[PDB]
Write an enzyme that holds these catalytic residues in place. Structure first.
Site, PDB file in Angstrom:
ATOM      1  N   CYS B  30       0.803  -1.211   0.000  1.00  0.00           N
ATOM      2  CA  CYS B  30       0.000   0.000   0.000  1.00  0.00           C
ATOM      3  C   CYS B  30       0.851   1.283   0.000  1.00  0.00           C
ATOM      4  O   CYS B  30       2.009   1.344   0.511  1.00  0.00           O
ATOM      5  CB  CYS B  30      -0.969  -0.036   1.221  1.00  0.00           C
ATOM      6  SG  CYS B  30      -0.149   0.166   2.839  1.00  0.00           S
ATOM      7  N   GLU B 103      -1.219  -7.601  -7.267  1.00  0.00           N
ATOM      8  CA  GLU B 103      -1.497  -8.530  -6.197  1.00  0.00           C
ATOM      9  C   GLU B 103      -3.005  -8.807  -6.092  1.00  0.00           C
ATOM     10  O   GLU B 103      -3.684  -8.024  -5.471  1.00  0.00           O
ATOM     11  CB  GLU B 103      -0.936  -7.971  -4.897  1.00  0.00           C
ATOM     12  CG  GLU B 103      -1.028  -9.009  -3.761  1.00  0.00           C
ATOM     13  CD  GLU B 103      -0.622  -8.449  -2.407  1.00  0.00           C
ATOM     14  OE1 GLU B 103      -1.100  -7.376  -2.072  1.00  0.00           O
ATOM     15  OE2 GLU B 103       0.174  -9.074  -1.654  1.00  0.00           O
ATOM     16  N   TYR B 169      -3.000 -13.822  -3.788  1.00  0.00           N
ATOM     17  CA  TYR B 169      -2.606 -13.289  -2.454  1.00  0.00           C
ATOM     18  C   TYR B 169      -3.227 -14.081  -1.304  1.00  0.00           C
ATOM     19  O   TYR B 169      -4.443 -14.038  -1.093  1.00  0.00           O
ATOM     20  CB  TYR B 169      -3.024 -11.815  -2.371  1.00  0.00           C
ATOM     21  CG  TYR B 169      -2.711 -10.968  -1.113  1.00  0.00           C
ATOM     22  CD1 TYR B 169      -3.402  -9.797  -0.903  1.00  0.00           C
ATOM     23  CD2 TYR B 169      -1.723 -11.325  -0.177  1.00  0.00           C
ATOM     24  CE1 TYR B 169      -3.133  -8.981   0.190  1.00  0.00           C
ATOM     25  CE2 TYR B 169      -1.427 -10.486   0.912  1.00  0.00           C
ATOM     26  CZ  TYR B 169      -2.179  -9.337   1.076  1.00  0.00           C
ATOM     27  OH  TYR B 169      -1.938  -8.494   2.098  1.00  0.00           O
ATOM     28  N   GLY B 170      -2.380 -14.798  -0.556  1.00  0.00           N
ATOM     29  CA  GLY B 170      -2.848 -15.594   0.564  1.00  0.00           C
ATOM     30  C   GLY B 170      -2.000 -15.349   1.811  1.00  0.00           C
ATOM     31  O   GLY B 170      -1.545 -16.296   2.480  1.00  0.00           O
ATOM     32  N   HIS B 172      -1.642 -12.181   5.204  1.00  0.00           N
ATOM     33  CA  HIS B 172      -2.500 -11.304   6.000  1.00  0.00           C
ATOM     34  C   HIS B 172      -3.931 -11.883   6.083  1.00  0.00           C
ATOM     35  O   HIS B 172      -4.924 -11.155   5.998  1.00  0.00           O
ATOM     36  CB  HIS B 172      -2.445  -9.896   5.427  1.00  0.00           C
ATOM     37  CG  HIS B 172      -1.021  -9.404   5.303  1.00  0.00           C
ATOM     38  ND1 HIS B 172      -0.402  -9.167   4.084  1.00  0.00           N
ATOM     39  CD2 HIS B 172      -0.069  -9.209   6.251  1.00  0.00           C
ATOM     40  CE1 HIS B 172       0.853  -8.798   4.293  1.00  0.00           C
ATOM     41  NE2 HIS B 172       1.074  -8.794   5.602  1.00  0.00           N
ATOM     42  N   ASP B 267       4.502  -8.945  10.664  1.00  0.00           N
ATOM     43  CA  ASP B 267       5.105  -8.966   9.353  1.00  0.00           C
ATOM     44  C   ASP B 267       5.914  -7.674   9.124  1.00  0.00           C
ATOM     45  O   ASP B 267       7.138  -7.694   8.994  1.00  0.00           O
ATOM     46  CB  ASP B 267       4.008  -9.183   8.264  1.00  0.00           C
ATOM     47  CG  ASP B 267       4.448  -8.727   6.853  1.00  0.00           C
ATOM     48  OD1 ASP B 267       5.610  -8.939   6.498  1.00  0.00           O
ATOM     49  OD2 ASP B 267       3.682  -8.202   6.003  1.00  0.00           O
ATOM     50  N   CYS B 348       9.609   2.923  11.785  1.00  0.00           N
ATOM     51  CA  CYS B 348       8.622   3.675  12.608  1.00  0.00           C
ATOM     52  C   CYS B 348       7.169   3.351  12.225  1.00  0.00           C
ATOM     53  O   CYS B 348       6.273   3.582  13.032  1.00  0.00           O
ATOM     54  CB  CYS B 348       8.823   5.193  12.521  1.00  0.00           C
ATOM     55  SG  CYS B 348       8.703   5.765  10.789  1.00  0.00           S
ATOM     56  N   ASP B 419      23.586  25.221  15.361  1.00  0.00           N
ATOM     57  CA  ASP B 419      22.807  24.712  16.489  1.00  0.00           C
ATOM     58  C   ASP B 419      23.648  24.805  17.804  1.00  0.00           C
ATOM     59  O   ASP B 419      24.898  24.699  17.769  1.00  0.00           O
ATOM     60  CB  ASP B 419      22.411  23.256  16.231  1.00  0.00           C
ATOM     61  CG  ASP B 419      21.183  22.793  17.030  1.00  0.00           C
ATOM     62  OD1 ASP B 419      21.010  23.096  18.280  1.00  0.00           O
ATOM     63  OD2 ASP B 419      20.343  22.029  16.455  1.00  0.00           O
TER      64      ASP B 419
HETATM   65  C1  LIG Z   1       1.233  -1.048   3.219  1.00  0.00           C
HETATM   66  C2  LIG Z   1       2.282  -0.440   3.960  1.00  0.00           C
HETATM   67  C3  LIG Z   1       2.624   1.031   3.655  1.00  0.00           C
HETATM   68  C4  LIG Z   1       3.356  -1.247   4.401  1.00  0.00           C
HETATM   69  C5  LIG Z   1       4.760  -0.636   4.456  1.00  0.00           C
HETATM   70  C6  LIG Z   1       3.334  -2.557   4.042  1.00  0.00           C
HETATM   71  C7  LIG Z   1       2.298  -3.149   3.315  1.00  0.00           C
HETATM   72  C8  LIG Z   1       1.232  -2.365   2.868  1.00  0.00           C
HETATM   73  N1  LIG Z   1       0.232  -2.967   2.110  1.00  0.00           N
HETATM   74  C9  LIG Z   1       0.349  -4.272   1.699  1.00  0.00           C
HETATM   75  C10 LIG Z   1      -0.584  -4.814   0.796  1.00  0.00           C
HETATM   76  O1  LIG Z   1      -1.160  -4.036  -0.021  1.00  0.00           O
HETATM   77  N2  LIG Z   1      -0.370  -6.139   0.411  1.00  0.00           N
HETATM   78  C11 LIG Z   1       0.650  -6.929   0.947  1.00  0.00           C
HETATM   79  O2  LIG Z   1       0.796  -8.086   0.604  1.00  0.00           O
HETATM   80  N3  LIG Z   1       1.537  -6.382   1.801  1.00  0.00           N
HETATM   81  C12 LIG Z   1       1.417  -5.050   2.142  1.00  0.00           C
HETATM   82  N4  LIG Z   1       2.370  -4.510   2.983  1.00  0.00           N
HETATM   83  C13 LIG Z   1       3.242  -5.459   3.804  1.00  0.00           C
HETATM   84  C14 LIG Z   1       4.592  -5.470   3.065  1.00  0.00           C
HETATM   85  O3  LIG Z   1       4.330  -6.022   1.787  1.00  0.00           O
HETATM   86  C15 LIG Z   1       5.718  -6.247   3.739  1.00  0.00           C
HETATM   87  O4  LIG Z   1       5.270  -7.568   3.918  1.00  0.00           O
HETATM   88  C16 LIG Z   1       6.091  -5.635   5.121  1.00  0.00           C
HETATM   89  O5  LIG Z   1       6.151  -4.210   5.042  1.00  0.00           O
HETATM   90  C17 LIG Z   1       7.408  -6.187   5.645  1.00  0.00           C
HETATM   91  O6  LIG Z   1       8.405  -5.951   4.700  1.00  0.00           O
HETATM   92  P1  LIG Z   1       9.507  -4.827   4.894  1.00  0.00           P
HETATM   93  O7  LIG Z   1       8.785  -3.488   4.926  1.00  0.00           O
HETATM   94  O8  LIG Z   1      10.178  -5.229   6.229  1.00  0.00           O
HETATM   95  O9  LIG Z   1      10.463  -5.002   3.708  1.00  0.00           O
HETATM   96  N1  LIG Z   2      18.360  30.198  19.424  1.00  0.00           N
HETATM   97  C1  LIG Z   2      18.817  29.017  18.989  1.00  0.00           C
HETATM   98  N2  LIG Z   2      20.030  29.002  18.326  1.00  0.00           N
HETATM   99  C2  LIG Z   2      20.502  27.831  17.792  1.00  0.00           C
HETATM  100  N3  LIG Z   2      19.788  26.648  17.922  1.00  0.00           N
HETATM  101  C3  LIG Z   2      18.603  26.661  18.552  1.00  0.00           C
HETATM  102  C4  LIG Z   2      18.078  27.810  19.103  1.00  0.00           C
HETATM  103  N4  LIG Z   2      16.880  27.457  19.674  1.00  0.00           N
HETATM  104  C5  LIG Z   2      16.677  26.149  19.512  1.00  0.00           C
HETATM  105  N5  LIG Z   2      17.739  25.640  18.809  1.00  0.00           N
HETATM  106  C6  LIG Z   2      17.962  24.267  18.347  1.00  0.00           C
HETATM  107  O1  LIG Z   2      16.938  23.978  17.395  1.00  0.00           O
HETATM  108  C7  LIG Z   2      16.802  22.579  17.304  1.00  0.00           C
HETATM  109  C8  LIG Z   2      15.325  22.248  17.094  1.00  0.00           C
HETATM  110  O2  LIG Z   2      15.287  20.867  16.789  1.00  0.00           O
HETATM  111  P1  LIG Z   2      13.984  19.980  16.940  1.00  0.00           P
HETATM  112  O3  LIG Z   2      13.407  20.247  18.269  1.00  0.00           O
HETATM  113  O4  LIG Z   2      14.323  18.567  16.680  1.00  0.00           O
HETATM  114  O5  LIG Z   2      12.940  20.684  15.846  1.00  0.00           O
HETATM  115  P2  LIG Z   2      12.418  19.998  14.480  1.00  0.00           P
HETATM  116  O6  LIG Z   2      11.689  18.693  14.897  1.00  0.00           O
HETATM  117  O7  LIG Z   2      11.391  21.007  13.979  1.00  0.00           O
HETATM  118  O8  LIG Z   2      13.519  19.787  13.485  1.00  0.00           O
HETATM  119  C9  LIG Z   2      17.391  21.995  18.614  1.00  0.00           C
HETATM  120  O9  LIG Z   2      18.497  21.147  18.287  1.00  0.00           O
HETATM  121  C10 LIG Z   2      17.788  23.219  19.436  1.00  0.00           C
HETATM  122  O10 LIG Z   2      18.960  23.042  20.204  1.00  0.00           O
HETATM  123  S1  SF4 Z   3      11.361   5.278   7.545  1.00  0.00           S
HETATM  124 FE1  SF4 Z   3       9.330   4.802   8.698  1.00  0.00          FE
HETATM  125  S2  SF4 Z   3       7.750   5.818   7.340  1.00  0.00           S
HETATM  126 FE2  SF4 Z   3       9.625   5.554   5.969  1.00  0.00          FE
HETATM  127  S3  SF4 Z   3       9.473   3.457   4.980  1.00  0.00           S
HETATM  128 FE3  SF4 Z   3      10.644   3.149   6.962  1.00  0.00          FE
HETATM  129  S4  SF4 Z   3       8.938   2.470   8.450  1.00  0.00           S
HETATM  130 FE4  SF4 Z   3       7.924   3.581   6.706  1.00  0.00          FE
END
Ligand SMILES: *c1c(C)c(C)cc2c1nc1c(=O)[nH]c(=O)nc-1n2C[C@H](O)[C@H](O)[C@H](O)COP(=O)(O)O
Ligand SMILES: Nc1ncnc2c1ncn2[C@@H]1O[C@H](COP(=O)(O)OP(=O)(O)O)[C@@H](O)[C@H]1O
Ligand code: SF4
Ligand SMILES: *c1c(C)c(C)cc2c1nc1c(=O)[nH]c(=O)nc-1n2C[C@H](O)[C@H](O)[C@H](O)COP(=O)(O)O
Ligand SMILES: Nc1ncnc2c1ncn2[C@@H]1O[C@H](COP(=O)(O)OP(=O)(O)O)[C@@H](O)[C@H]1O
Ligand code: SF4
Lengths: 729, 729
Positions: B30, B103, B169-170, B172, B267, B348, B419
């Protein structure tokens, strides 16, 4: 004949430079079309125009990508491509002699901007109480000017799209209301603090919009005159009347609501908590200070209640959202004196649940054609006439079989409808007896009335109630050309549930200390003091049974393996439902299910009790540490709300004898409603409507294709645009 | 240059009638495009084809409207419209020499059919454990034949659309798996019971699809070889391997996963729980029995791990979904030995979270062009080059400021990034030190690496860390043409929260018994034994602090006024997170918030404690009975996780002196990332990417329009269709 007392609802009324032809007004409401499904948007609104409504409004219509409601679907008026798509609706509405209106929207942080990724702006920085991970940038004075300009540029596109009425939208705690309301607005400049300063943003927006388009379009405004939160948000007799007096000279018409966005079920009052006219004590306060025309929604379906609010001077115009969805022809029916054809909204909020889920089109429990007008060509009042003398036997008169009967008779077929039950309405009859659900009656009251009426006009048609159950031989020898099995579902008696798909050991509703919903609703089987409800359903059954038993003096605990009442988040019923359970002292144990049951006790376990780490431990063995959270709880009675099954025994018997249909002159047998699969009431009603609409198709068991409103590759949304990939390099 | 040991990854491999050019394969995933945003689908897949991926697959692709995933967005291949839309992707993928795959999907009751309203069919009737209000009809023999025919017709459409690879597709726990798995399949006929019988549905489907398109297309299958649930579902060494043996002659290539649909974070393993290669113990079991090429995903980003699984004979092909999203050019970068250019996926699951929410486009924490290739024209590896010698100062090197520097330097600009922090990464440096989140550090590692290399080639640019904080005077005198303010956000210290938008009386993180997330993560402030975390945030902070604190021996209670870890439902982290909190004895109090705090104690309330009945009671009073649930609880330490606020003081001081910008030769100053509004990391990254791409636009503070993929009224989706409203009468 129309009651002459209802003549007042057909008098015109001036709103700025425009005239409404009568007092029936569709206020802005979502339908899941926006500017994205122009066929749906134009058909749904123009059927109501044909039905007699004087003005039809789009839902909330974003003025700019930084107010993008994705994942929910709003209308949009960002550019010429939206002008074209929305003009399909205004052109169609105009053909039936009604006005069209658009509701200019900016959400602040309440719009999560999941498509646009833009940053919303607001009077102060806050994280939305409704979208809790969405924050806004605090506006400086140039931000204020540029967002006001978004409104003006949108009002101008709105006039280009053919709208007659343009709103500035300050209900459901959207931007103008945010600046008005100290719950959001913590500024200490000239846009915060006193009422004059707090009102400034909305007043300047009205003035700028009116200046841009107001000699051509009526300028409406929608206002949550009371947040129904007590002091600290907006109170009708504090800031509300006073804001009205400040804004009265700019507004051509007031459109009044109550409540906020997080609990907008206080506006779209579910019938479980609120009657027709529930908003009157707040809405009536506006005509006490305004010299302009005023409406204020309140689930108005009854012309008797409508003339009351007009002749007592509480409103000038009848605003409706839901009532127009349940019956797009409500005005014409009142005009022609067809009171008994009015299909009255039940305030179930299923229409709203669709929008809240984010993405899906609207559906409606009463009106199986809502959402279907364009894509399936189903007009609520016009049915294709049969060209043959075929007859249809329908077994079962719940929502699905009754709707099939109603639609087939409307289409001219000979129909015999039969049920063991004494009256029409199937499982809805016990459901509507649950605490608060009395208006859900109207669904079977409408169908009883209509079927009785329809019998007078086909003389071969028949309704037979309190009959012996039909058997396979009865059906085979009945004499019908086609047969519909609409035999419903029943709650599980053996613990079967969506988590394991298997019975629970010891679950058995024939035992003295266990009950199904039906046994509880029937009220003959004794129920002891301490009651546990074991729940694997996310809609209303378990909380409604809990309320019933607790009000009847039982000590109730709900043990839920799924999120209790989750679907009531979407119908907006959840907040008041949870307050009700709380007042009633119902104990809730979430995140637990039951592995076995004995007389007076049951074993429960925490659903997150398995070890967090999965390893490969080979076959025959769980990959996690064992769940050791199991413990015993006691009960005097156990109510099983674990899921439903289709009652399809009869269907199974007929199908096993399909080789016998031809010799009995039976051309087809179809399975609809809960007997095919347990459905929402709205969807069971749908399946009966659809089989009736498609009874002549090759395979009426399976819907034919509907028109799809998806872009065609090679056609750009923007007129003159380039649809091909182009990298910026 | 490339390490010679990686040469193996660039060897071709035959799959039935087709040849993969190398061992890099994008499995189906997806993206939020389906057949509805053909621009997005064709750009996203074709950039990867340009990037060296040997095959690119659509996401799950519905074969018929009775498998409609609305509100979630799947691809579809229901008719000729879809064939045209998807062919944009196959044509574009072919232009770069890759294979294109589709798929074929049928979900049974897991597809809630909210658009189509059709009834899903299944081996036995069940309510889905994922969509708990959605039920299927049990299949009779003709149903089975009909659904099989849907697969056949879709596979023929797929060949028309130009696909090289067609899956049954078999995985999930979709339909072929449902027949295989006695968790769903309760039949006692010849499609139930023994393995041979349970496999019969999937085997016949494969034979039919191979028969229809097999001479022209590779037939692949995706198989959840173990449900990771223990006995009771599929286990690899029980049914898994035996099924592979039965189906081996029908399949051109095996694509192996583990897990079910309700918990498919097993997965798509989050880095929080799973390392690269986490699936190997199950996946390698397939090559023990299959004679055909095999892949199985495992968050593979490192070529060293990749050659390991191929040389040991555990897999032939490297399947990837997430790694291909983080870096569409991963294969070309390995091919050229540019290992330090690889943008490594942090696991993430923010990409997935969008899909799960239902409807929005995918976004990616690492790759701010994911989803943007088509609509903004943003190629991940090609940057429009500046034509001037403009310089840009960037204050803050967090995800937004460091992204902005990276892109501006790639675009040829002079940049000075500064910074106070010792290292690049801003607030991500503490976040990645939370339990389980160490791999989130790759987001800043990538940017640290890239920025260091860009400075070597962009000689007038500069990086300064460990600096004194920039003041407004320092910025004004600095000598840049444009300035970007990226100063971040901080957790609130006074209780301010999304429920009341006000401080809580008695909240103050300068007190010795109260702490913010930053004070907890800093580790200097002493924490007492009994810890209360007060939470109004729905993502990871509160749960992660609870884990950290309970693992360090504190007794932890979480009082949450919002749904605890709600957003982790969407990242698929929620189930193992709850298991982790349970096994650590973290107590949770849901549905409560806090009205006041004092030394060692706080007063909490049930959020549903107000009376359930609203009545008009006049100004100055609540419309409901008072909430009387207030009670005190004790703590030794209170951790405040109530919300965040932008750090925008520097910005406000510069804006207060905007009149001096021109004197100082400053052409503009823009505000990005968390200092404009607290965002997800992916969105803070996007803001820096955006301003960099748009630094020459009239107003870089605001995004220019993107191409919208919405239908144009007047153009029917079906070729030759009629767009106009037509009623069936
Ligand atoms: C959607 C999303 C954005 C994620 C990243 C995975 C995913 C998504 N939709 C899928 C779907 O449409 N069909 C399907 O078979 N699998 C789908 N996936 C799962 C993906 O294919 C992987 O199995 C997993 O993301 C694990 O693989 P990896 O990301 O570790 O390489
Ligand atoms: N006046 C300043 N001068 C220099 N750096 C600053 C100042 N104020 C804040 N910062 C720095 O800005 C950065 C902001 O980062 P962060 O909180 O991760 O924001 P974002 O997620 O938007 O990138 C921090 O590393 C902080 O130390
Ligand atoms: S960095 Fe996070 S949002 Fe980007 S593909 Fe990897 S798991 Fe997904
Ligand atoms: C969507 C839905 C389906 C409902 C029924 C109401 C609604 C919807 N969307 C709205 C929106 O786009 N803007 C707006 O201002 N109001 C919207 N509403 C609320 C509706 O307008 C009414 O205020 C309520 O439904 C109560 O009125 P009534 O249905 O009782 O007549
Ligand atoms: N053999 C039968 N003969 C006559 N009526 C039946 C028979 N079996 C079930 N019924 C009736 O079918 C109805 C199904 O209604 P309901 O459960 O509301 O289904 P749905 O929601 O699909 O309309 C019930 O009123 C029940 O009495
Ligand atoms: S779904 Fe219930 S609420 Fe909504 S208009 Fe229909 S009927 Fe009234």
């Amino acid at each position: 004949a129309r009651d002459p007392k209802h003549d007042i609802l057909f008098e015109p009324i001036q709103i700025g430079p425009k005239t409404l032809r009568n007092r029936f007004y569709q206020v802005p409401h979502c339908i899941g079309a926006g500017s994205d499904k122009p066929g749906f948007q134009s058909a749904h609104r123009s059927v109501k125009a044909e039905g007699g409504w004087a003005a039809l409004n789009t839902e909330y219509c974003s003025i700019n990508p930084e107010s993008d409601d994705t994942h929910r679907l709003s209308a949009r008026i960002w550019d010429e491509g939206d002008v074209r798509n929305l003009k399909a609706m205004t052109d169609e509405v105009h053909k039936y002699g009604a006005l069209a209106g658009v509701e200019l929207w900016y959400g602040g942080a309440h719009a999560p901007n999941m498509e646009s990724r833009a940053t919303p702006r607001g009077p102060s920085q806050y994280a939305s109480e409704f979208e809790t991970l969405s924050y806004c940038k605090e506006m400086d004075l140039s931000d204020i000017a540029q967002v006001q300009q978004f409104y003006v540029d949108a009002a101008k596109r709105s006039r280009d799209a053919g709208f007659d009425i343009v709103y500035v939208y300050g209900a459901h705690s959207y931007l103008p209301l945010q600046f008005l309301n100290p719950y959001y607005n913590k500024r200490t400049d000239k846009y915060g603090g006193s009422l004059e300063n707090r009102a400034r943003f909305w007043l300047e927006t009205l003035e700028k919009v009116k200046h841009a388009v107001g000699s051509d379009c009526a300028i409406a405004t929608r206002f949550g005159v009371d947040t129904v939160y007590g002091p600290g948000q907006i109170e009708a007799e504090v800031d509300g009347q006073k804001f009205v007096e400040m804004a009265d000279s700019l507004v051509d018409m007031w459109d009044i609501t109550i409540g906020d966005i997080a609990e907008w079920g206080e506006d779209a009052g579910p019938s479980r908590f609120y009657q027709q006219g529930h908003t009157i004590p707040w809405v009536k306060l506006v005509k006490q200070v305004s010299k302009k025309p005023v409406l204020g929604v309140g689930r108005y379906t009854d012309p008797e209640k409508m003339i009351e609010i007009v002749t007592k001077g509480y409103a000038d115009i009848i605003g409706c959202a839901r009532p127009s969805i349940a019956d797009p022809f409500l005005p014409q029916k009142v005009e022609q004196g067809r009171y008994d054809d009015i299909r009255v909204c039940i305030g179930c909020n299923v229409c709203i649940s669709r929008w809240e889920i984010g993405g899906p089109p609207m559906i409606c429990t009463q009106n199986a054609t809502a959402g279907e007008e364009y894509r399936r060509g189903w007009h609520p009042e016009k049915f294709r006439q049969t060209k043959n003398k075929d007859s249809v036997l329908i077994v079962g008169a719940g929502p699905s079989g009754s709707e099939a009967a109603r639609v087939l008779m409307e289409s001219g077929y000979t129909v015999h409808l039969t049920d063991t039950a004494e009256k029409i309405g199937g499982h809805l009859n016990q459901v509507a007896a649950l605490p608060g659900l009395g208006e859900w009656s109207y669904h079977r009251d409408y169908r009883e009335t209509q079927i009785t009426k329809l019998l007078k006009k086909n003389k071969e048609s028949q309704l037979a109630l309190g009959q012996k159950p039909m058997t396979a031989d009865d059906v085979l020898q009945y004499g019908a050309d086609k047969v519909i099995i609409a035999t419903g579902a029943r709650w599980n008696t053996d613990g079967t549930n969506c988590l394991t798909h298997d019975p629970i050991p010891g679950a058995d509703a024939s035992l003295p200390d266990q009950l199904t919903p039906e046994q509880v609703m029937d009220g003959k089987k004794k129920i002891g003091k301490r009651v546990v409800i074991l729940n694997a359903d996310t809609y209303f059954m378990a909380p409604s049974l809990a309320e019933k038993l607790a009000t009847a003096g039982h000590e109730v605990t709900i043990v839920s393996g799924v999120h209790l009442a989750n679907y009531m988040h979407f119908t907006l019923e959840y907040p008041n439902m949870m307050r009700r359970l709380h007042e009633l002292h119902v104990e809730e144990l979430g995140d637990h299910f039951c592995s076995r049951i004995e007389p007076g006790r049951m074993e429960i376990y925490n659903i997150w009790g398995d070890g967090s780490k999965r390893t490969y431990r080979g076959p025959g063995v769980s990959p996690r540490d064992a769940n050791t959270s199991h413990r015993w709880i006691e009960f005097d009675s156990l109510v099983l709300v674990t899921g439903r099954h289709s009652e399809c025994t009869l269907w199974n018997e007929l199908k096993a004898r399909e080789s016998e249909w031809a010799e009995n002159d039976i051309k087809g047998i179809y399975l609809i409603g809960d007997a095919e699969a347990p459905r929402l009431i709205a969807d069971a009603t749908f399946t009966g409507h659809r089989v009736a609409r498609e009874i002549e198709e090759a395979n009426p068991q399976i819907a034919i294709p509907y028109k799809r409103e998806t872009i065609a590759w090679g056609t750009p949304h923007m007129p003159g645009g380039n649809f091909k990939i182009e990298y910026k390099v």
